[PDB]
Protein backbone atom coordinates (compact mmCIF):
# COMPACT_ATOMS: atom_id res chain seq x y z
CA UNK A 1 0.00 0.00 0.00
CA UNK A 2 2.80 2.40 0.92
CA UNK A 3 4.31 2.13 -2.58
CA UNK A 4 2.05 5.00 -3.67
CA UNK A 5 4.02 7.29 -1.35
CA UNK A 6 7.16 6.62 -3.38
CA UNK A 7 5.31 7.53 -6.56
CA UNK A 8 3.90 10.77 -5.16
CA UNK A 9 7.33 11.70 -3.87
CA UNK A 10 8.73 11.58 -7.38
CA UNK A 11 5.82 13.68 -8.62
CA UNK A 12 6.44 16.25 -5.91
CA UNK A 13 10.15 16.31 -6.70
CA UNK A 14 9.34 16.85 -10.37
CA UNK A 15 7.53 20.06 -9.45
CA UNK A 16 10.60 21.23 -7.56
CA UNK A 17 12.73 20.57 -10.63
CA UNK A 18 10.18 22.42 -12.75
CA UNK A 19 10.48 25.42 -10.44
CA UNK A 20 14.23 25.53 -11.04
CA UNK A 21 13.67 25.60 -14.79
CA UNK A 22 11.16 28.41 -14.39
CA UNK A 23 13.76 30.42 -12.49
CA UNK A 24 16.26 29.95 -15.30
CA UNK A 25 13.59 31.12 -17.74
CA UNK A 26 12.54 33.99 -15.47
CA UNK A 27 15.86 35.86 -15.42
CA UNK A 28 16.88 35.11 -18.99
CA UNK A 29 18.09 38.70 -19.46
CA UNK A 30 19.75 39.57 -16.13
CA UNK A 31 23.40 40.47 -16.84
CA UNK A 32 26.07 38.31 -15.25
CA UNK A 33 23.70 35.49 -14.33
CA UNK A 34 24.67 31.82 -14.07
CA UNK A 35 22.07 29.15 -14.75
CA UNK A 36 21.10 26.86 -11.88
CA UNK A 37 21.68 23.17 -12.54
CA UNK A 38 19.36 20.41 -11.38
CA UNK A 39 19.59 16.65 -10.91
CA UNK A 40 17.72 13.72 -9.40
CA UNK A 41 19.28 11.50 -6.72
CA UNK A 42 17.98 8.05 -5.82
CA UNK A 43 17.76 7.20 -2.13
CA UNK A 44 17.70 3.42 -1.51
CA UNK A 45 15.81 2.93 1.74
CA UNK A 46 17.17 -0.16 3.48
CA UNK A 47 15.65 -2.38 6.14
CA UNK A 48 14.44 -5.95 6.60
CA UNK A 49 13.08 -8.54 4.17
CA UNK A 50 14.25 -7.48 0.69
CA UNK A 51 15.09 -3.92 -0.32
CA UNK A 52 12.85 -2.77 -3.16
CA UNK A 53 11.64 0.77 -2.42
CA UNK A 54 13.90 3.54 -3.77
CA UNK A 55 12.82 7.12 -3.16
CA UNK A 56 13.71 10.03 -5.44
CA UNK A 57 14.90 13.50 -4.43
CA UNK A 58 15.87 16.65 -6.30
CA UNK A 59 19.15 18.50 -5.89
CA UNK A 60 21.13 21.38 -7.39
CA UNK A 61 24.84 20.57 -7.91
CA UNK A 62 25.74 24.25 -8.15
CA UNK A 63 25.62 26.50 -11.18
CA UNK A 64 27.51 26.21 -14.48
CA UNK A 65 30.36 28.59 -15.29
CA UNK A 66 29.94 28.72 -19.07
CA UNK A 67 30.50 32.39 -20.01
CA UNK A 68 27.49 33.83 -21.77
CA UNK A 69 27.58 36.01 -24.85
CA UNK A 70 27.93 39.74 -24.29
CA UNK A 71 26.34 42.92 -25.62
CA UNK A 72 28.40 45.86 -26.88
CA UNK A 73 26.83 48.83 -25.12
CA UNK A 74 29.88 51.10 -25.70
CA UNK A 75 29.42 52.35 -22.14
CA UNK A 76 32.86 53.36 -20.81
CA UNK A 77 32.30 51.75 -17.39
CA UNK A 78 30.80 48.39 -18.39
CA UNK A 79 33.21 45.46 -18.23
CA UNK A 80 33.20 41.75 -19.04
CA UNK A 81 35.33 39.17 -17.26
CA UNK A 82 37.54 36.41 -18.66
CA UNK A 83 36.68 32.72 -19.02
CA UNK A 84 36.95 32.05 -15.28
CA UNK A 85 37.12 35.53 -13.80
CA UNK A 86 35.14 36.94 -10.89
CA UNK A 87 34.76 40.46 -9.56
CA UNK A 88 34.91 40.78 -5.77
CA UNK A 89 32.24 42.82 -4.00
CA UNK A 90 31.29 43.35 -0.36
CA UNK A 91 28.06 41.71 0.76
CA UNK A 92 25.50 43.09 3.19
CA UNK A 93 26.98 41.18 6.15
CA UNK A 94 30.51 42.47 5.51
CA UNK A 95 31.83 39.29 3.90
CA UNK A 96 33.10 39.32 0.34
CA UNK A 97 31.46 37.59 -2.58
CA UNK A 98 32.30 36.91 -6.20
CA UNK A 99 30.09 37.97 -9.10
CA UNK A 100 30.19 38.66 -12.82
CA UNK A 101 27.81 41.64 -13.11
CA UNK A 102 30.08 44.09 -14.91
CA UNK A 103 27.52 46.91 -14.78
CA UNK A 104 29.21 49.42 -12.50
CA UNK A 105 27.25 52.48 -11.36
CA UNK A 106 28.54 55.75 -9.92
CA UNK A 107 26.62 57.53 -7.19
CA UNK A 108 26.54 61.20 -6.27
CA UNK A 109 29.74 60.83 -4.21
CA UNK A 110 32.12 58.78 -6.37
CA UNK A 111 31.04 55.44 -4.90
CA UNK A 112 31.31 52.54 -7.34
CA UNK A 113 28.51 50.02 -6.89
CA UNK A 114 27.22 46.85 -8.53
CA UNK A 115 23.58 45.98 -7.77
CA UNK A 116 23.87 48.37 -4.83
CA UNK A 117 26.87 46.53 -3.35
CA UNK A 118 30.23 48.28 -2.92
CA UNK A 119 33.14 47.17 -5.10
CA UNK A 120 36.50 46.37 -3.51
CA UNK A 121 39.83 46.24 -5.32
CA UNK A 122 43.39 46.54 -4.07
CA UNK A 123 43.25 47.74 -0.48
CA UNK A 124 39.57 48.28 0.23
CA UNK A 125 36.38 49.68 -1.29
CA UNK A 126 37.55 52.04 -4.02
CA UNK A 127 36.16 55.54 -4.53
CA UNK A 128 36.80 57.64 -7.65
CA UNK A 129 36.88 61.47 -7.41
CA UNK A 130 33.63 63.42 -7.32
CA UNK A 131 32.56 63.97 -10.92
CA UNK A 132 35.30 62.58 -13.14
CA UNK A 133 34.89 60.45 -16.24
CA UNK A 134 36.04 56.87 -15.65
CA UNK A 135 38.01 54.53 -17.91
CA UNK A 136 38.87 50.92 -17.08
CA UNK A 137 42.01 49.28 -18.45
CA UNK A 138 42.46 45.67 -19.57
CA UNK A 139 43.97 44.62 -16.22
CA UNK A 140 41.61 46.50 -13.89
CA UNK A 141 43.50 49.79 -13.65
CA UNK A 142 41.11 52.75 -13.35
CA UNK A 143 41.89 56.12 -14.94
CA UNK A 144 39.81 59.11 -13.83
CA UNK A 145 39.69 62.41 -15.70
CA UNK A 146 38.16 65.42 -13.99
CA UNK A 147 35.94 67.26 -16.50
CA UNK A 148 37.40 70.47 -17.89
CA UNK A 149 40.98 69.50 -17.10
CA UNK A 150 43.28 69.00 -20.09
CA UNK A 151 43.30 65.42 -21.43
CA UNK A 152 46.98 65.03 -20.51
CA UNK A 153 46.04 65.00 -16.80
CA UNK A 154 44.64 61.45 -16.65
CA UNK A 155 45.77 59.78 -13.43
CA UNK A 156 45.16 56.27 -12.07
CA UNK A 157 42.85 56.21 -9.05
CA UNK A 158 42.81 52.51 -8.23
CA UNK A 159 42.79 48.95 -9.49
CA UNK A 160 40.10 46.27 -9.36
CA UNK A 161 40.52 42.88 -7.68
CA UNK A 162 39.82 39.93 -9.98
CA UNK A 163 39.83 36.35 -8.71
CA UNK A 164 39.97 33.09 -10.67
CA UNK A 165 37.69 30.32 -9.40
CA UNK A 166 37.49 27.02 -11.26
CA UNK A 167 33.75 26.56 -10.68
CA UNK A 168 33.78 23.25 -8.78
CA UNK A 169 34.62 24.99 -5.49
CA UNK A 170 32.18 27.94 -5.45
CA UNK A 171 28.65 27.78 -4.05
CA UNK A 172 25.86 30.28 -4.59
CA UNK A 173 24.55 32.18 -1.58
CA UNK A 174 20.87 32.87 -0.91
CA UNK A 175 21.04 36.32 -2.55
CA UNK A 176 22.76 35.46 -5.85
CA UNK A 177 26.38 35.90 -4.75
CA UNK A 178 28.99 33.15 -4.85
CA UNK A 179 31.37 32.16 -2.06
CA UNK A 180 34.16 29.65 -1.57
CA UNK A 181 33.11 26.30 -0.12
CA UNK A 182 34.77 24.70 2.89
CA UNK A 183 37.39 22.84 0.85
CA UNK A 184 38.11 25.90 -1.28
CA UNK A 185 38.70 28.20 1.69
CA UNK A 186 40.69 25.50 3.48
CA UNK A 187 43.05 25.00 0.53
CA UNK A 188 43.28 28.59 -0.79
CA UNK A 189 42.91 30.67 2.39
CA UNK A 190 40.00 32.69 3.70
CA UNK A 191 40.19 35.29 0.91
CA UNK A 192 41.52 34.72 -2.60
CA UNK A 193 44.43 36.70 -4.02
CA UNK A 194 44.19 38.65 -7.26
CA UNK A 195 46.17 37.12 -10.10
CA UNK A 196 47.62 39.18 -12.98
CA UNK A 197 46.62 36.57 -15.57
CA UNK A 198 42.98 37.71 -15.55
CA UNK A 199 42.12 40.20 -18.31
CA UNK A 200 38.93 42.22 -18.71
CA UNK A 201 37.63 44.53 -21.41
CA UNK A 202 35.48 47.63 -21.06
CA UNK A 203 32.47 48.70 -23.09
CA UNK A 204 30.68 45.33 -23.13
CA UNK A 205 28.35 43.62 -20.67
CA UNK A 206 27.96 39.86 -20.24
CA UNK A 207 24.43 38.45 -20.21
CA UNK A 208 23.11 35.24 -18.74
CA UNK A 209 23.91 31.73 -20.00
CA UNK A 210 20.59 29.91 -20.39
CA UNK A 211 20.15 27.31 -23.13
CA UNK A 212 16.56 27.32 -24.45
CA UNK A 213 16.86 23.79 -25.84
CA UNK A 214 17.87 22.42 -22.44
CA UNK A 215 14.92 24.18 -20.78
CA UNK A 216 12.42 22.93 -23.37
CA UNK A 217 13.65 19.34 -23.16
CA UNK A 218 13.63 19.43 -19.35
CA UNK A 219 10.07 20.79 -19.29
CA UNK A 220 8.84 18.11 -21.70
CA UNK A 221 10.55 15.38 -19.67
CA UNK A 222 9.08 16.75 -16.43
CA UNK A 223 5.56 16.80 -17.89
CA UNK A 224 5.82 13.22 -19.15
CA UNK A 225 7.32 11.97 -15.88
CA UNK A 226 4.60 13.69 -13.84
CA UNK A 227 1.85 12.17 -15.96
CA UNK A 228 3.39 8.70 -15.64
CA UNK A 229 3.59 9.09 -11.86
CA UNK A 230 -0.08 10.11 -11.76
CA UNK A 231 -0.94 7.00 -13.78
CA UNK A 232 0.98 4.83 -11.31
CA UNK A 233 -0.76 6.49 -8.35
CA UNK A 234 -4.27 6.03 -9.74
CA UNK A 235 -3.53 2.42 -10.70
CA UNK A 236 -2.28 1.66 -7.18
CA UNK A 237 -5.32 3.31 -5.60
CA UNK A 238 -7.73 1.40 -7.84
CA UNK A 239 -5.95 -1.89 -7.16
CA UNK A 240 -6.01 -1.34 -3.40
CA UNK A 241 -9.66 -0.28 -3.41
CA UNK A 242 -10.81 -3.92 -3.32
CA UNK A 243 -8.69 -5.46 -0.55
CA UNK A 244 -11.11 -3.78 1.86
CA UNK A 245 -14.02 -5.44 0.04
CA UNK A 246 -12.20 -8.76 0.37
CA UNK A 247 -11.72 -8.13 4.09
CA UNK A 248 -15.39 -7.16 4.51
CA UNK A 249 -16.64 -10.78 4.47
Amino acid sequence: DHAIYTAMGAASQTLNQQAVTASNLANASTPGFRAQLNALRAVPVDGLSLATRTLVTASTPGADMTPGQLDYTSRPLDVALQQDGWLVVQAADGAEGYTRNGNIQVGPTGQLTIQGHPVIGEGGPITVPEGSEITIAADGTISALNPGDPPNTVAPVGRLKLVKAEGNEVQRSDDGLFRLTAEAQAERGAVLAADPSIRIMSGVLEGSNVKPVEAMTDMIANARRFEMQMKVITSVDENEGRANQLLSM
Partner: protein, 259 residues
Protein backbone atom coordinates in the same frame (compact mmCIF):
# COMPACT_ATOMS: atom_id res chain seq x y z
CA UNK B 1 14.21 8.42 -22.87
CA UNK B 2 17.42 8.34 -24.91
CA UNK B 3 15.81 9.87 -28.01
CA UNK B 4 15.37 13.23 -26.27
CA UNK B 5 19.04 13.22 -25.22
CA UNK B 6 20.18 12.39 -28.76
CA UNK B 7 18.05 15.18 -30.22
CA UNK B 8 19.31 17.60 -27.57
CA UNK B 9 22.90 16.81 -28.54
CA UNK B 10 22.03 17.38 -32.19
CA UNK B 11 20.38 20.72 -31.45
CA UNK B 12 23.35 21.85 -29.37
CA UNK B 13 25.73 20.90 -32.18
CA UNK B 14 23.66 22.91 -34.66
CA UNK B 15 23.61 25.87 -32.28
CA UNK B 16 27.41 25.75 -31.94
CA UNK B 17 27.75 25.61 -35.73
CA UNK B 18 25.53 28.67 -36.09
CA UNK B 19 27.60 30.37 -33.39
CA UNK B 20 30.87 29.87 -35.26
CA UNK B 21 29.24 30.97 -38.54
CA UNK B 22 28.00 34.16 -36.88
CA UNK B 23 31.46 34.73 -35.42
CA UNK B 24 33.02 34.42 -38.87
CA UNK B 25 30.47 36.79 -40.40
CA UNK B 26 30.68 39.42 -37.64
CA UNK B 27 34.38 40.26 -37.95
CA UNK B 28 34.59 40.12 -41.74
CA UNK B 29 36.24 43.56 -41.59
CA UNK B 30 38.84 42.58 -38.98
CA UNK B 31 42.40 42.87 -40.26
CA UNK B 32 44.40 39.65 -40.33
CA UNK B 33 41.51 37.41 -39.29
CA UNK B 34 41.57 33.68 -40.08
CA UNK B 35 38.12 32.16 -40.47
CA UNK B 36 37.08 29.15 -38.40
CA UNK B 37 35.24 25.92 -39.10
CA UNK B 38 33.77 23.47 -36.59
CA UNK B 39 34.22 19.71 -36.97
CA UNK B 40 32.08 17.26 -34.99
CA UNK B 41 32.28 13.57 -34.13
CA UNK B 42 29.74 10.91 -33.20
CA UNK B 43 29.61 9.45 -29.70
CA UNK B 44 29.89 5.78 -28.69
CA UNK B 45 27.47 3.03 -29.73
CA UNK B 46 25.76 0.53 -27.43
CA UNK B 47 25.72 -3.03 -28.79
CA UNK B 48 22.59 -4.61 -27.35
CA UNK B 49 23.29 -7.96 -28.99
CA UNK B 50 26.08 -9.23 -31.22
CA UNK B 51 25.37 -10.55 -34.73
CA UNK B 52 24.68 -14.28 -34.84
CA UNK B 53 25.50 -16.92 -37.42
CA UNK B 54 24.74 -16.06 -41.05
CA UNK B 55 25.73 -16.81 -44.65
CA UNK B 56 24.86 -20.49 -44.17
CA UNK B 57 22.83 -21.45 -47.27
CA UNK B 58 20.81 -18.28 -46.63
CA UNK B 59 20.79 -14.59 -47.51
CA UNK B 60 19.33 -13.34 -44.23
CA UNK B 61 20.10 -9.84 -43.04
CA UNK B 62 22.48 -9.63 -40.06
CA UNK B 63 20.46 -9.32 -36.85
CA UNK B 64 22.63 -6.91 -34.91
CA UNK B 65 21.31 -4.13 -32.67
CA UNK B 66 23.73 -1.24 -32.19
CA UNK B 67 22.14 1.99 -30.96
CA UNK B 68 23.83 5.34 -31.44
CA UNK B 69 24.25 8.06 -28.85
CA UNK B 70 24.53 11.37 -30.68
CA UNK B 71 27.17 13.86 -31.78
CA UNK B 72 29.62 16.20 -30.06
CA UNK B 73 31.74 19.08 -31.37
CA UNK B 74 35.29 17.75 -31.44
CA UNK B 75 37.30 20.71 -32.75
CA UNK B 76 37.28 24.16 -34.36
CA UNK B 77 40.11 24.76 -36.83
CA UNK B 78 41.14 28.01 -38.50
CA UNK B 79 42.47 28.15 -42.06
CA UNK B 80 45.86 29.91 -42.03
CA UNK B 81 45.67 30.86 -45.70
CA UNK B 82 46.80 34.16 -47.24
CA UNK B 83 44.33 37.03 -47.42
CA UNK B 84 44.19 39.94 -49.82
CA UNK B 85 46.00 43.23 -49.24
CA UNK B 86 44.30 46.62 -48.93
CA UNK B 87 46.14 49.90 -49.33
CA UNK B 88 46.10 52.36 -46.44
CA UNK B 89 49.01 54.69 -47.37
CA UNK B 90 49.96 54.81 -43.67
CA UNK B 91 53.73 54.45 -43.35
CA UNK B 92 53.43 52.59 -40.02
CA UNK B 93 51.30 49.69 -41.33
CA UNK B 94 52.94 46.41 -42.35
CA UNK B 95 51.40 43.54 -44.28
CA UNK B 96 53.02 40.11 -44.08
CA UNK B 97 53.52 37.69 -46.99
CA UNK B 98 53.76 33.95 -46.40
CA UNK B 99 53.91 32.68 -42.82
CA UNK B 100 54.85 34.45 -39.63
CA UNK B 101 53.61 36.33 -36.57
CA UNK B 102 54.72 39.59 -35.01
CA UNK B 103 55.65 39.00 -31.38
CA UNK B 104 54.05 41.36 -28.86
CA UNK B 105 54.52 41.55 -25.09
CA UNK B 106 51.45 41.02 -22.94
CA UNK B 107 51.27 43.26 -19.84
CA UNK B 108 51.48 40.36 -17.38
CA UNK B 109 54.94 39.44 -18.67
CA UNK B 110 54.35 36.67 -21.19
CA UNK B 111 54.31 37.06 -24.97
CA UNK B 112 51.70 36.65 -27.70
CA UNK B 113 51.85 36.46 -31.48
CA UNK B 114 49.67 38.25 -34.01
CA UNK B 115 49.07 38.85 -37.71
CA UNK B 116 47.28 42.22 -37.52
CA UNK B 117 49.75 44.72 -38.93
CA UNK B 118 48.65 48.22 -37.95
CA UNK B 119 51.08 49.93 -35.60
CA UNK B 120 51.29 53.27 -33.82
CA UNK B 121 53.87 55.18 -31.79
CA UNK B 122 53.53 56.02 -28.10
CA UNK B 123 54.84 59.17 -26.43
CA UNK B 124 58.27 57.60 -25.85
CA UNK B 125 58.80 56.63 -29.50
CA UNK B 126 58.43 52.87 -29.13
CA UNK B 127 56.41 51.04 -31.78
CA UNK B 128 53.27 49.43 -30.35
CA UNK B 129 50.18 47.76 -31.72
CA UNK B 130 46.69 49.23 -31.63
CA UNK B 131 45.96 48.64 -27.96
CA UNK B 132 49.25 49.64 -26.36
CA UNK B 133 50.97 46.24 -26.35
CA UNK B 134 54.62 46.94 -27.09
CA UNK B 135 56.28 45.02 -29.90
CA UNK B 136 58.78 42.67 -28.28
CA UNK B 137 61.85 43.47 -30.45
CA UNK B 138 61.29 47.05 -29.18
CA UNK B 139 61.71 49.32 -32.17
CA UNK B 140 62.19 52.93 -31.05
CA UNK B 141 61.72 55.66 -33.66
CA UNK B 142 63.53 58.88 -32.67
CA UNK B 143 61.94 62.31 -32.73
CA UNK B 144 62.15 64.75 -35.67
CA UNK B 145 61.72 61.74 -37.96
CA UNK B 146 60.98 62.90 -41.51
CA UNK B 147 59.66 59.51 -42.64
CA UNK B 148 59.85 55.85 -41.57
CA UNK B 149 60.60 53.23 -44.23
CA UNK B 150 60.38 49.48 -43.64
CA UNK B 151 61.85 47.36 -46.41
CA UNK B 152 60.84 43.95 -47.67
CA UNK B 153 63.25 42.60 -45.06
CA UNK B 154 62.72 43.47 -41.41
CA UNK B 155 65.10 46.44 -41.36
CA UNK B 156 63.46 49.76 -40.47
CA UNK B 157 65.16 53.06 -41.28
CA UNK B 158 64.35 56.74 -40.81
CA UNK B 159 65.80 59.69 -42.70
CA UNK B 160 67.04 62.62 -40.63
CA UNK B 161 67.11 66.35 -41.40
CA UNK B 162 70.58 66.90 -42.83
CA UNK B 163 72.08 63.44 -43.22
CA UNK B 164 71.66 61.98 -46.70
CA UNK B 165 72.09 58.33 -45.70
CA UNK B 166 69.21 56.80 -43.72
CA UNK B 167 70.04 55.57 -40.23
CA UNK B 168 69.06 52.03 -39.27
CA UNK B 169 67.10 51.85 -36.02
CA UNK B 170 66.00 48.21 -35.77
CA UNK B 171 65.02 44.90 -37.31
CA UNK B 172 61.49 43.47 -37.29
CA UNK B 173 62.23 39.77 -37.12
CA UNK B 174 59.20 37.50 -36.86
CA UNK B 175 58.35 34.08 -35.45
CA UNK B 176 57.19 30.84 -37.03
CA UNK B 177 55.59 27.69 -35.64
CA UNK B 178 55.52 24.03 -36.59
CA UNK B 179 51.71 23.94 -36.31
CA UNK B 180 49.99 27.31 -36.69
CA UNK B 181 46.52 25.80 -36.21
CA UNK B 182 47.25 24.82 -32.62
CA UNK B 183 47.79 28.35 -31.34
CA UNK B 184 45.32 29.33 -28.61
CA UNK B 185 43.33 32.40 -29.62
CA UNK B 186 42.36 35.18 -27.20
CA UNK B 187 40.89 38.63 -27.73
CA UNK B 188 42.59 41.48 -29.57
CA UNK B 189 43.80 39.20 -32.40
CA UNK B 190 46.35 37.50 -30.16
CA UNK B 191 47.60 33.91 -30.18
CA UNK B 192 49.49 32.20 -27.36
CA UNK B 193 51.56 29.05 -27.60
CA UNK B 194 50.24 25.68 -26.46
CA UNK B 195 51.52 22.12 -26.33
CA UNK B 196 49.84 21.36 -29.67
CA UNK B 197 51.93 24.04 -31.40
CA UNK B 198 55.69 23.67 -31.32
CA UNK B 199 58.07 26.08 -29.68
CA UNK B 200 58.25 29.31 -31.71
CA UNK B 201 61.39 30.12 -33.66
CA UNK B 202 62.40 33.69 -34.49
CA UNK B 203 64.00 34.60 -37.80
CA UNK B 204 64.54 37.55 -40.11
CA UNK B 205 61.89 38.01 -42.82
CA UNK B 206 62.53 36.18 -46.07
CA UNK B 207 64.68 33.44 -44.51
CA UNK B 208 63.98 30.07 -42.89
CA UNK B 209 60.43 30.02 -44.22
CA UNK B 210 59.53 33.47 -42.92
CA UNK B 211 57.45 35.93 -44.92
CA UNK B 212 58.10 39.37 -46.34
CA UNK B 213 56.98 42.81 -45.19
CA UNK B 214 55.06 45.27 -47.37
CA UNK B 215 54.86 48.80 -46.01
CA UNK B 216 51.58 50.67 -46.17
CA UNK B 217 49.32 47.65 -46.70
CA UNK B 218 46.98 45.72 -44.42
CA UNK B 219 46.06 42.05 -44.75
CA UNK B 220 42.32 41.41 -45.03
CA UNK B 221 40.28 38.60 -43.52
CA UNK B 222 39.99 35.36 -45.51
CA UNK B 223 36.24 34.95 -45.04
CA UNK B 224 34.06 33.69 -47.90
CA UNK B 225 30.46 34.85 -47.45
CA UNK B 226 29.13 32.43 -50.07
CA UNK B 227 30.14 29.53 -47.84
CA UNK B 228 28.59 31.24 -44.82
CA UNK B 229 25.15 31.77 -46.36
CA UNK B 230 24.77 28.17 -47.51
CA UNK B 231 26.06 26.94 -44.15
CA UNK B 232 23.42 29.09 -42.44
CA UNK B 233 20.69 27.60 -44.62
CA UNK B 234 21.92 24.07 -43.94
CA UNK B 235 22.15 24.52 -40.17
CA UNK B 236 18.71 26.14 -40.04
CA UNK B 237 17.15 23.23 -41.92
CA UNK B 238 18.93 20.67 -39.74
CA UNK B 239 17.73 22.50 -36.63
CA UNK B 240 14.16 22.39 -37.93
CA UNK B 241 14.43 18.66 -38.66
CA UNK B 242 15.74 17.91 -35.17
CA UNK B 243 12.95 19.99 -33.65
CA UNK B 244 10.46 17.92 -35.64
CA UNK B 245 12.05 14.76 -34.23
CA UNK B 246 11.68 16.14 -30.69
CA UNK B 247 8.03 16.96 -31.37
CA UNK B 248 7.29 13.46 -32.67
CA UNK B 249 8.96 11.80 -29.68
CA UNK B 250 7.01 14.07 -27.33
CA UNK B 251 3.73 13.22 -29.07
CA UNK B 252 4.32 9.47 -28.87
CA UNK B 253 5.33 9.70 -25.20
CA UNK B 254 2.20 11.74 -24.47
CA UNK B 255 0.11 9.11 -26.25
CA UNK B 256 1.76 6.43 -24.10
CA UNK B 257 1.15 8.23 -20.81
CA UNK B 258 -2.57 8.62 -21.62
CA UNK B 259 -2.92 4.88 -21.07
Amino acid sequence: ISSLWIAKTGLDAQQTNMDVIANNLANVSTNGFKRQRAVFEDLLYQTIRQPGAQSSEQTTLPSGLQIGTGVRPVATERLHSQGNLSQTNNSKDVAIKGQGFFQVMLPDGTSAYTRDGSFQVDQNGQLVTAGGFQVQPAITIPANALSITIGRDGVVSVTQQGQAAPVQVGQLNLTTFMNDTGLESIGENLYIETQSSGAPNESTPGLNGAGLLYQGYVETSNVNVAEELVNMIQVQRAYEINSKAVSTTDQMLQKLTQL
